[PDB]
Amino acid sequence: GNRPLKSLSDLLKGKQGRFRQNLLGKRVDYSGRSVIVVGPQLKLHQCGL
Amino acid sequence: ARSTGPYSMITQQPLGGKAQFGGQRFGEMECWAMQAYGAAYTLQELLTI
Amino acid sequence: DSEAVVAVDAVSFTLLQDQLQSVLDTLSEREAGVVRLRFGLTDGQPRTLDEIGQVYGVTRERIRQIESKTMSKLRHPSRSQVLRDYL
Amino acid sequence: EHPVLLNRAPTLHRLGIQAFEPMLVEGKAIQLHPLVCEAFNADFDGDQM
DNA sequence: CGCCCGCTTCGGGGCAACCCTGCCAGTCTAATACAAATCCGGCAATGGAGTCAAGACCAGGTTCG
DNA sequence: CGAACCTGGTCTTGACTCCATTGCCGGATTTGTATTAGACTGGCAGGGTTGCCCCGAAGCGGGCG
Ligand SMILES: [Mg+2]
Question: Do C4 and B12 touch (CB under 8 A)?
């Protein structure tokens, strides 16, 4: 498909190297996301879940 | 949500996206935020275990 | 990575080992020694009837009698309800 | 009494991650207290945390 | 005479945000000939490993004199 | 107070069965290697347009032993 290959130098350079992609910012366990809504009866230190 | 799920192949991070379980990318700017608080133990948690 | 450590079967396996050693300690000592040597629970080497009768100094038919008696004891559900959920 | 963190990408500054005491809420959307919208830069147009 | 160096331009690598969300890419002379290796299928030496039947053997809980 | 019992196993003994485990041994298949005599004699072939920045290279006008 005429795709240039990925050598050893391309494992470190740029945004997709090991540094910016897997050394500093990792996917973490014990995690989750959702959409947010306003909670006007909560206390300041409380939150919905 | 994800407590413990599938894992990536070459590196051993948790995987990505709602199609799998995956975690949310605790990326570089969030590492800066928790450095700026000074929370060192939670950063060690989220990047090692 | 479908060969990675699943991290819940490992702790289930450790709890299996703890509960299994407890249930095997509910019996007497010759019995549990025969079971552990017959199924290799002490080194991973499955000893057979002649080695067990040699290390206890009896005949292999006595070992098979003790084996059948204990495996009849274990199939009683009082020694089995805590292990039934582990399949 | 077991706090959780609430990231919001993009984490521009230090208050993008805060720690709230959770409480259980009917529904499937995270209820955020309204007085941290200014720190999170979070309107309720469909933002996710 | 040919000799060398100060500005100019040409080129060349590096970088340009961040959450989710996705999921599997191409093409022709053609066969023989032989030998080592490998493998697999079937009896054939087992003796070890298990299994049963039978009994001898106690020494203690159950009943009669 | 003793007799006799029958029963908790405890252990052994011998006889029998089954079954793995090499061991040849021969055929099937699998993989490697060699060999084909008319003549044939220097590639396709594609993309590529951002912008900015820093720096290093090649060159041209300027003077000079
Ligand atoms: Mg918004």
Answer: yes
